[PDB]
Structure 1
């Protein structure tokens, strides 16, 4: 582990991106996470909220 620092930089960036992409699955309270479904099975007034 002589090159700990450079390796650390790389890992930090990779991990940040990973969490950012992973967070798309969260629902945040909406009935579902994917946009297409919301726009499919709901009227515009309620799909808006």
Structure 2
């Protein structure tokens, strides 16, 4: 059968899919000049980078 174990497949997929979205949003720059903390620290001063 192609998908008789779909329940276990749905379980192992929902965990990885939600976890990959968390890594995806790590590269998302929330209204900032850069998403990498090393890029903002290398471009702005502490009073402006905050």
| Superposition TM-score, scaled by structure 2 size | 0.88
Cα distance in 2, alignment partners of residues 2 and 38 from structure 1: 50
How much is the aligned-residue C-alpha RMSD, in angstroms? 0.7
Which blocks of at least 5 consecutive residues in structure 2 are unaligned? none
Higher helix share goes to which structure? 1
Cα distance in 1, alignment partners of residues 46 and 21 from structure 2: 31
1:11-44 C-alpha deviation (Å, 9 max, x unpaired): 0001011000111111110011010111111111
How many residue pairs align between the two structures?
Answer: 48
Cα distance in 2, alignment partners of residues 12 and 43 from structure 1: 41
